[PDB]
Design a binder for these strands. Structure first.
Lengths: 62, 62, 62, 62
DNA sequence: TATATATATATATATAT
DNA sequence: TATATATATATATATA
């Protein structure tokens, strides 16, 4: 998620904002921006990032 | 005291613990100067507001 | 793994991504780049790195 | 060999055990070249002092 | 909570204009 | 004089 002024929402790979999660995350996989601390392109990781790594594989397998 | 005042990472606070102890130990001698060889665990008067403000001062030291 | 743009996949020693694991992992051991946090060279560690160390030797023994 | 030298303590041993074995293997290969297909448990000679020297050179690697 | 590796303004210094 | 170039410190995220 980006932290710039007026962009407290998730950013897409095309520098487009995600207003409502329930309408997009279901359609298909998405591409996001790179995480960096530069003031022009600042973005911090999210709450549940990196945690759900093994579960995806286990479930796809099952 | 270590149970009632300090509450963090049950044993992962080696800095704050020690500085707290130093504050109390060096404050006790001020308000009961007649006694000798005072230690932490020793039962004499010691004000907590003074200690709080002491640490609040150490915070903004330059 | 590499986390750069459009590189949501692994990365070897020779800067070459991978699509389907099953195609190369079996043939011969491979070496990958080192973990790093640079904005240009952003490499993170894998999900299952580290865990499987013992059973390998146990099997080589048997 | 993992009981006489390395006690069970310090579960954070992923690196330690791996590099230990990787050192013993090479020290064995050096002093007994005529043979082939050596291993960890293969009974050939090795200088534990040299193992120490290697682990130290690693401890101060820059 | 901690350490650590990243980072970024802010000198002072060197040199060429 | 102006312009460019190099160390120090100080604040923020990420991992355990």
């Amino acid at each position: 998620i980006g932290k710039l002024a007026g962009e407290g929402k998730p950013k897409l790979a095309n520098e487009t904002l995600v207003s409502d999660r329930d309408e997009l995350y279901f359609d298909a996989v998405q591409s996001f921006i790179v995480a960096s601390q530069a003031a022009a392109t600042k973005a911090s990781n999210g709450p549940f990032n990196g945690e759900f790594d093994r579960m995806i594989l286990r479930l796809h397998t099952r | 005291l270590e149970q009632i005042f300090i509450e963090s990472n049950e044993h992962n606070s080696h800095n704050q613990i020690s500085q707290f102890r130093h504050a109390v130990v060096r404050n006790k001698c001020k308000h009961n100067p007649t006694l000798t060889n005072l230690s932490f665990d020793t039962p004499v008067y010691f004000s907590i507001d003074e200690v709080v403000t002491y640490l609040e001062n150490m915070n903004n030291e330059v």
